[PDB]
Ligand binder design. Structure first.
Ligand code: CLA
Ligand SMILES: CCCCCCCCCCCCCCCC(=O)OC[C@H](CO[C@@H]1O[C@H](CS(=O)(=O)O)[C@@H](O)[C@H](O)[C@H]1O)OC(=O)CCCCCCCCCCCCCCC
Ligand SMILES: CCCCCCCCCCCCCCCC(=O)OC[C@H](CO[C@@H]1O[C@H](CS(=O)(=O)O)[C@@H](O)[C@H](O)[C@H]1O)OC(=O)CCCCCCCCCCCCCCC
Ligand SMILES: CCCCCCCCCCCCCCCC(=O)OC[C@H](CO[C@@H]1O[C@H](CS(=O)(=O)O)[C@@H](O)[C@H](O)[C@H]1O)OC(=O)CCCCCCCCCCCCCCC
Ligand SMILES: CCCCCCCCCCCCCCCCCC(=O)O[C@@H](COC(=O)CCCCCCCCCCCCCCC)COP(=O)(O)OC[C@H](O)CO
Ligand SMILES: CC1=C(/C=C/C(C)=C/C=C/C(C)=C/C=C/C=C(C)/C=C/C=C(C)/C=C/C2=C(C)CCCC2(C)C)C(C)(C)CCC1
Ligand SMILES: [Zn+2]
Lengths: 426, 600, 478
């Protein structure tokens, strides 16, 4: 409806204006996407439980030695909407846990052993990747509008009460909190960000559950329909609350209240997409933090190290965080993707590398769903006859694609797009 | 025990082969953690063994023993191990430090898949360190000294996908290899003179020796230049500035390798180096120059990890000075205290880095209120390095004032001065990372989890007990108190640290401070442009002539071998025309055959 | 016994024609393994402290030519034979997957020639087996190889043919100037004549063996014939022929002219030092890997000349150990570089990168490459350090300046091997050019066996030396 403008990335904008598909829409491109969602949703289903366990039960533990062993009832914790007593009821299936995740907790990759022995012999769910994300949303300040609330006079008082109620047994810690009151007060903030991230993955795990079932039935036929299901699920849950609710012995301390008006879109979805998909503090085995070699940026706005910019061939090597997720997202693979990988480069040997490239593909459509939801929320739909209402959408898409071209620190020589559009990138 | 202490370097050498079971191409399932766990187990068991062996040799004489590596015609390669007190004590020091750094790595190296490659190389240092402190043969004190060079190459180059590591690991291997190679020339020319290399036959030899002055001058200069490069001393010091790629071997390399790899070889060579009073003055010169340079350069740094490695160079130059005054006891004592303090310092800096991603001193700010431990640990590691006679590093740097004042006074004038600049560096490293206004990069700094601040606090206790651990057992270091000099080091250090605190916690000066002379600020900041020096003097030469030689080989030699062939081709291609195809010409040649042989 | 070592490969070569393919490969493996095992058994029964010949065989063959079939094995000769047979077994195991009937034939003929030339106490018989080695290696360079086979191959041929000439020119001469019949060595062949002629004969033997060893200015066939040769060809050629040349030089030019060698030592030490420095500085500049490794071979062979320039009992044990070490290390490096060139499809130093990361990028041949490159340079725990240090400790009592220059050459060797390892193993993978094929299990077996033997002989080095201890004494102390 509009003329072609100038961009080197213009071939993508014409696809965003007309429907969607930040990446091409071939069937082989969507099989891997839905399989990667199914593979990424089960470790996510453990992540959102363990992060809540950290934010409520391990509030500020000096020695949280275990810290990855949620209580028996946090696997029975009702996912707020998957079952009968749901809240918005997506993913029809049971709302307590996943049989596949419970099986992996039970038997692991070796056999039916006690959970502690499943931890020492690694055989685990690599929970350290979910904590790294939670610590990456903080330190970027990207929590949303509660970070400004997470400062003083309502939080410092509630955090003080909670801390004084938590350490009441040992006077060593109590005395320490008296000397340095801001030592455990910044560890309280960390538990709050853990709770926020764990509340974000209580929405995406059912979404990624249900999208695989929709693909199984046959309701999903093209990437456009997948991202549209994602956008609909995004708008459906954009109003759910965010809170902390630290639980101590026979007591609950309202740390950030539900009555403050923090919602899921502006405090856990948008500040997350920019933190983990875009910023994701730089890799340790790819860039030099050397302060003289001006390689890592000085402002946090130019951190181009997220999944959208990541380099997935060195996966499984030293100094690269995302490997922790790809080993975590490897044994929960559907069969039609294991068969798709086994007939390819290096077979079932380098399966982590291609498994990560497919994850990059999937996260591209997730962020495209975020882009479409963003424009449908703050701008005009595609079926708009007015020309200025269509130029607004074009300006928004050009701005959001300019984030992929800014040549500050090779930010344009990263950015795996125009590389994901290639069918020979896998 | 104490009769099987020589098995300590094998425990870790058993962890350096087992940890590779978990490298990402062997397990491919459930990998990355029990390798580090079992390496920690091995290190703990080798530390218990060493502690017991030290207790058992409290009041006993050194019980040497030895095996035979090979006995070819002329030489008899003897591998002797000494079980003296300072050997098992150094074994405790090495194994406890490796335990601290490995418990640290358990916390730091999460979100990292290479633990096979990391902990196997960390086990090959703990084994190499033990084999270096046990074995007291100048020959086998070089074997492991080179194996550790190779290990440093693979350890710095841990994450090789970073283009500044494959350049730092290159320099760290070449610079440290050249020194270890002139040390080979030195150990090679000490056999015809002493008939052995056992650190005891050498001692007896140096006792009664009357050989040429310049000969021992040269061989001791080589024996110097070995540890000179191994200990990151001028001019072989750029490798340490670039060996700050890969945190916490840096907590162990700058702290347990650099301290007892070349300094250990340099101290046990005191009898030999005493033979020439020119190697000693050169030793003083190198030590003092590198001390002054390291302190002045550390003051002018912006990277917190490189504002402590130059201090490592300086405090190893201090050991060079001490061993230059024929004082090996002071060096053996100071290594312990300095190593403890620098371990605390590096662990605190690593803890700050892990959660405050930047390393720029210009981007880190107010952390004291929200991060106490990591700050007090840095402060105690600071006080246990220069001054505060309470803390233990004072004692060994007190005798080196008395000794440098008794003889050769100007050297003391450095040791005193080295105590204020090195105090102004740490000062500005504390007042920049823990004091001042808080900045974007560190706006939300949570304190680190249990495995990164346990070793740090457990190693912060050792430093506080060191002074009192030298009271229960009368290990007097500086005999004559003479408080006139004990009140000099403290004044110098406190003055340096105080001016540092005033310049940065004073808000009475622009914070990106500029020097009245701008040209020297960006000269200390780029370590006197040492790379531009290397690429000019050695590399530029070794490269140039290289590009000549190959070209020569490709042009003059090869061509000279081909010309013959080519000529023999031409001589055949332009002599077939002698068969002209005309029978009358053939009869002419037959007739020219005759009447010529008839003439001859 | 030695007759078996010489005939079994010859029988296999004559049997490669008229044989069905499946049987072709199986029987080649069988013959090579049998010869190898027989070599090990001979090595065990080699009971030492003998100071004389062992396993001798004497048959009169060609009376009007001397040329008695007179074998015999010593401490200098037997380790070289075991090395040749091991390398032959490996080369047959990783043979070419093309025209693989004229390959096993020629490889077995080459091994026969090498084993014969080593264990031959007859001058003209040695030359027979030498010029027998001449041609099949030409055929190996020519059929299998690279773009520039022909030129390369031709070069080798001629620089070897000329070699033969000189050797022959110095046998016939020194076989007649002593009016001796029966050219067989350790015999009526007794020099005992005037100088100014011993000099000419010694120079002829130097130029005839230093051109194959190879020495400093006579080396200009080595870079061209190592690089344009397939990996089994390169392994076999390097090990076999280099050791044949070095053995020839040591044995003949030291057992026949000990009065002229003591006078030419002063020049040969400087020539060897220049050779080490030259090989290192010429390798530093090369931007192809096989060229770096070839100049490595040159530099490591110059150590043998520096060792022989000093008549020390130690500096000859060191020379034999350096020959064995260079054989093993060059075999390992050529095998690894051949694997790399096959899987990656390129051999330059500016497109290779990141071959060390686990999944997508070849990491156990890169680890072995770093372990072989550090063994080549002087790094303890491996064989190269033991050999080089024996040479150094033996050569310092004599001329001390060439030994120091040799140490500098070792440093430069470390330099260029670090260059190669940095631009080959470290760095990052290009993410358009990756997708290397997998490396199958019985294709990195030879490298993984060579590596085990290298790491063993460097920490327990007695098993490198206990064979040539009394023989070196018999060589120099006479
Ligand atoms: C007399 C024997 C002795 C021994 C074995 C110890 C060892 C100990 N001291 Mg006290 N300490 C003593 C007295 C002793 N100290 C002496 C003589 C000195 C040298 C002057 C010290 C120097 C010292 C300091 C500065 C500190 C300790 C502390 C401690 C405890 C640290 C762990 C803890 O807090 O548990 C319970 C530990 C029991 C720490 C402590 O007590 O914290 C409250 C502490 O800060 N030790
Ligand atoms: C410097 C010290 C050197 C000592 C190291 C000893 C060499 C490794 C021993 C290997 C044992 C035999 C099995 C190897 C083959 C295998 O199992 O799978 C092959 C796969 C490799 O990926 C695979 O690579 C294969 C290609 S290739 O084999 O790597 O060539 C292919 O199968 C597929 O890519 C991929 O899965 O697994 C590996 O072998 C990689 C791990 C083994 C290499 C470890 C090297 C890392 C440490 C280097 C430095 C050591 C430092 C510590 C102190 C020295
Ligand atoms: C007997 C008397 C005793 C007195 C003893 C005196 C000892 C003084 C200590 C030694 C001084 C070191 C000089 C070398 C400095 C250098 O080369 O680089 C300069 C570095 C560069 O860092 C720079 O830092 C900059 C950013 S920032 O400033 O670090 O934040 C960055 O841009 C730049 O690249 C970086 O290099 O910055 C400095 O540290 C400047 C220090 C000089 C300030 C001295 C002024 C004196 C004040 C008067 C005292 C006040 C009274 C208080 C009484 C308690
Ligand atoms: C006396 C005998 C014993 C002594 C030992 C022998 C002397 C060794 C000295 C080392 C000389 C350096 C080798 C030359 C390297 C080269 O060719 O190119 C230069 C290389 C790049 O080569 C490049 O390397 C590249 C690969 S890589 O990415 O760089 O790794 C490659 O692609 C490119 O083609 C290649 O040119 O870059 C370097 O210069 C790195 C060398 C750093 C060495 C540190 C110095 C060590 C000696 C200490 C000096 C003290 C005195 C200094 C003055 C006071
Ligand atoms: C004194 C200087 C020292 C510096 C180093 C030089 C030392 C060299 C030693 C000489 C060895 C002989 C080298 C012969 C070169 C053969 C290489 C060659 O290329 O062969 C050519 C041809 O070879 C021949 O013609 C054979 C004749 C060579 C005969 C050489 C004998 C030289 C011996 C010198 C002895 C001199 C007598 C002195 C006695 C007092 C073919 O060249 P091309 O480019 O065409 O190659 C491709 C090929 O043709 C395609 O198929
Ligand atoms: C985690 C953390 C925390 C805490 C921590 C802590 C609290 C720690 C502690 C620690 C400690 C608390 C440590 C201690 C140590 C100690 C030591 C280490 C000691 C030692 C001693 C000794 C060694 C001794 C010796 C001696 C004596 C005295 C007796 C006899 C012998 C003599 C010398 C010989 C918190 C909560 C903040 C949170 C955050 C972080
Ligand atoms: Zn755990």
């Amino acid at each position: 409806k509009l003329p072609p403008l100038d961009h080197p990335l213009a071939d993508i904008i014409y696809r965003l204006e007309a429907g969607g598909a930040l990446i091409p829409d071939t069937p082989v491109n969507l099989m891997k996407i839905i399989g990667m969602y199914k593979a990424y949703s089960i470790p996510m289903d453990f992540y959102w439980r363990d992060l809540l366990y950290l934010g409520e039960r391990v509030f500020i533990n000096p020695f949280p030695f275990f810290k990855y062993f949620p209580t028996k009832e946090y696997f029975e914790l009702p996912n707020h909407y998957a079952g009968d007593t749901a809240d918005l009821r997506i993913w029809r299936g049971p709302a307590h846990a996943h049989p596949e995740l419970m099986e992996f907790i039970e038997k692991g990759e070796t056999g039916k052993m006690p959970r502690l022995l499943h931890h020492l012999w690694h055989d685990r769910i690599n929970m350290e990747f979910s904590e790294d994300l939670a610590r990456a949303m903080m330190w970027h300040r990207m929590g949303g509008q509660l970070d400004i609330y997470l400062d003083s006079e309502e939080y410092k008082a509630a955090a003080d009460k909670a801390i004084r109620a938590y350490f009441k047994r040992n006077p060593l810690m109590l005395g320490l909190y008296k000397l340095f009151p801001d030592l455990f007060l910044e560890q309280a903030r960390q538990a709050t960000y853990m709770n926020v991230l764990g509340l974000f993955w209580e929405v995406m795990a059912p979404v990624f559950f249900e999208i695989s079932d929709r693909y199984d039935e046959g309701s999903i036929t093209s990437v456009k329909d997948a991202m549209n299901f994602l956008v609909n699920g995004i708008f459906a849950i954009a109003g759910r609350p965010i809170y902390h609710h630290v639980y101590i012995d026979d007591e609950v301390h309202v740390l950030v209240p539900k009555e403050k008006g923090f919602m899921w879109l502006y405090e856990a979805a948008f500040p997350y997409v920019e933190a983990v998909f875009y910023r994701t503090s730089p890799f340790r085995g790819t860039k030099s933090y050397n302060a003289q070699a001006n390689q890592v940026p000085t402002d946090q706005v130019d951190f181009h190290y997220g999944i959208l910019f990541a380099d997935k061939f060195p996966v499984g090597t030293a100094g690269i965080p995302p490997t922790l997720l790809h080993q975590d997202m490897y044994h929960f693979l559907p069969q039609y993707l294991k068969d798709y990988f086994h007939q390819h480069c290096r077979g079932e040997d380098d399966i982590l590398v291609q498994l990560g490239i497919a994850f990059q593909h999937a996260m591209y459509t997730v962020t495209s769903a975020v882009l479409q939801a963003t424009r449908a929320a703050f701008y005009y739909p595609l079926d708009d006859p007015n020309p200025e209402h269509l130029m607004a959408n074009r300006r928004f898409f050009v701005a959001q694609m300019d984030r992929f071209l800014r040549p500050q620190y090779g930010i344009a020589e990263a950015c795996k797009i125009r590389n994901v559009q290639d069918p020979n990138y896998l | 025990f104490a009769d099987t202490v020589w098995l300590i370097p094998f425990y870790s050498l058993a962890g350096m082969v087992l940890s590779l079971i978990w490298s990402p191409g062997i397990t491919r399932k459930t990998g990355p953690r029990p390798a580090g766990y079992l390496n920690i187990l091995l290190t703990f068991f080798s530390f218990v063994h060493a502690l017991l062996a030290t207790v058992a040799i409290a009041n006993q004489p050194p019980q040497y023993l030895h095996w035979t590596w090979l006995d070819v015609a002329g030489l008899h390669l003897d591998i002797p191990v000494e079980i003296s007190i300072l050997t098992t004590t150094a074994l405790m020091l090495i194994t406890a430090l490796n335990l601290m750094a490995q418990v640290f790595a358990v916390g730091y190296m999460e979100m990292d898949w290479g633990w096979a490659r990391f902990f196997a190389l960390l086990a090959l240092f703990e084994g190499g360190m033990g084999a270096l402190v046990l074995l007291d043969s100048l020959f086998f004190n070089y074997v492991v000294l080179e194996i550790l060079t190779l290990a440093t190459y693979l350890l710095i180059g841990l994450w090789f996908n970073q283009p500044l590591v494959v350049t730092g690991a290159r320099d760290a291997f070449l610079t440290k290899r050249v020194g270890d190679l002139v040390l080979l020339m030195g150990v090679l020319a000490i056999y015809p003179l002493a008939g052995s290399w056992n650190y005891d036959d050498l001692a007896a030899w140096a006792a009664t020796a009357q050989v040429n002055s310049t000969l021992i001058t040269l061989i001791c200069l080589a024996l110097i230049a070995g540890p000179m490069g191994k200990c990151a001393q001028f001019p072989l010091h750029l490798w340490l500035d670039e060996a700050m790629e890969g945190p916490i071997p840096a907590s162990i390399l700058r702290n347990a390798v650099v301290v007892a790899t070349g300094a250990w070889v340099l101290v046990k060579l005191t009898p030999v180096l005493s033979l020439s009073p020119v190697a000693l003055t050169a030793l003083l010169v190198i030590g003092s120059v590198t001390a002054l340079g390291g302190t002045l350069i550390a003051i002018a740094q912006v990277d917190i990890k490189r504002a402590l490695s130059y201090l490592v160079s300086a405090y190893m130059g201090w050991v060079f000075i001490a061993v230059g005054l024929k004082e090996p006891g002071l060096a053996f004592v100071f290594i312990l205290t300095y190593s403890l303090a620098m371990a605390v310092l590096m662990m605190s800096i690593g803890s700050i880095i892990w959660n405050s991603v930047t390393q720029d001193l210009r981007l880190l700010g107010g952390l004291w209120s929200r991060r106490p431990i990591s700050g007090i640990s840095f402060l105690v590691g600071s006080a246990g390095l220069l001054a505060v006679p309470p803390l233990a590093s004072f004692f060994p740097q007190a005798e080196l004032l008395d000794t440098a004042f008794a003889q050769l006074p100007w050297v003391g004038g450095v040791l005193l001065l080295m105590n204020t600049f090195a105090a102004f560096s740490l000062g500005r490293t504390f007042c920049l990372v823990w004091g001042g206004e808080v900045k974007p990069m560190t706006a939300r700094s949570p304190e680190v989890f249990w495995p990164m601040i346990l070793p740090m606090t457990v190693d912060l206790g050792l430093v506080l007990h060191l002074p009192i651990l030298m009271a229960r057992f009368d290990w007097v270091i500086w005999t004559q108190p003479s408080l006139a000099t004990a009140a000099a080091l403290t004044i110098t250090a406190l003055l340096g640290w105080g001016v540092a605190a005033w310049v940065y916690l004073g808000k009475a000066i622009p914070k990106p401070v500029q020097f009245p002379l701008p040209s020297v600020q960006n000269l200390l900041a780029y370590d006197f442009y040492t790379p531009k020096l290397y690429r000019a003097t050695v590399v530029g030469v070794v490269d140039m002539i290289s590009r000549i030689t190959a070209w020569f080989d490709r042009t003059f030699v090869d061509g000279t071998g081909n010309a013959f062939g080519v000529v023999t081709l031409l001589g055949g291609d332009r002599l077939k025309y002698s068969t002209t195809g005309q029978s009358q010409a053939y009869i002419l040649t037959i007739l020219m055959g005759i009447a010529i042989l008839v003439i001859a | 016994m030695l007759t078996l070592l010489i005939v079994l490969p010859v029988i296999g070569a004559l049997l490669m024609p008229l044989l069905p393919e499946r049987v072709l490969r199986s029987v080649a493996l069988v013959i090579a393994g049998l010869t190898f095992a027989l070599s090990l058994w001979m090595l065990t029964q080699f009971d030492v402290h003998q100071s004389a010949l062992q396993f001798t065989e004497f048959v009169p063959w060609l009376l009007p030519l001397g040329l008695n079939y007179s074998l015999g094995v010593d401490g200098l000769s037997l380790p070289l034979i075991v090395l040749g047979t091991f390398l032959t077994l490996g080369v047959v195991f990783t043979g070419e997957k093309t025209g693989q009937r004229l390959f096993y034939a020629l490889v077995l003929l080459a091994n026969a020639g090498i084993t014969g030339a080593l264990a031959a106490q007859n001058l003209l018989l040695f030359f027979l087996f030498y010029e027998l080695e001449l041609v099949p290696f030409y055929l190996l360079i020519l059929i299998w190889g690279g773009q520039r086979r022909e030129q390369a191959a031709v070069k080798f041929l001629i620089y070897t043919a000329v070699s033969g000439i000189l050797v022959l020119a110095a046998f016939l001469a020194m076989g007649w100037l002593t009016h001796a019949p029966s050219f067989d060595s350790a015999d009526i062949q007794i020099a005992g004549l005037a100088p100014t002629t011993q000099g000419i004969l010694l120079l002829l033997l130097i130029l005839g063996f230093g051109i194959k060893m190879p020495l400093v200015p006579l080396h200009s066939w080595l870079p061209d014939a190592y690089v344009e040769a397939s990996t089994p060809t390169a392994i076999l050629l390097g090990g076999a022929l280099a050791k044949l040349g070095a053995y020839g030089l040591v044995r003949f030019a030291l057992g026949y002219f000990p009065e002229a060698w003591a006078q030419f030592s002063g020049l040969l030490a400087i020539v060897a030092a220049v050779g080490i420095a030259y090989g290192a500085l010429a390798a530093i500049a090369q931007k192809d890997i096989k060229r770096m490794v070839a100049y490595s071979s040159i530099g490591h062979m110059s150590y043998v000349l520096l060792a022989a320039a000093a008549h020390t009992h130690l500096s000859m044990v060191g020379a034999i150990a350096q020959m064995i070490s260079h054989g093993l290390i060059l075999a390992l490096l050529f095998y690894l570089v051949g694997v790399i060139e096959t899987k990656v499809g390129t051999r330059e130093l500016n497109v290779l990168n990141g071959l060390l990361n686990p999944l997508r990028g070849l990491p156990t041949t890169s680890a072995l490459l770093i372990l072989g490159g550090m063994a080549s340079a002087g790094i303890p725990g491996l064989v190269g350090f033991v050999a080089e240090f024996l040479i150094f400790q033996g050569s310092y009592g004599m001329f001390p300046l060439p030994t120091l220059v040799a140490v500098v050459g070792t440093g430069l060797t470390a330099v260029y091997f670090v260059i190669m390892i940095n631009r080959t193993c470290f760095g990052r993978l290009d993410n358009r050019t990756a997708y290397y094929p997998r490396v199958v299990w019985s294709e990195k077996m030879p490298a993984l066996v060579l590596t085990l033997l290298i790491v063993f002989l460097g920490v327990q080095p007695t098993w490198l030396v206990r064979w040539s201890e009394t023989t070196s004494a018999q060589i120099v102390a006479a």
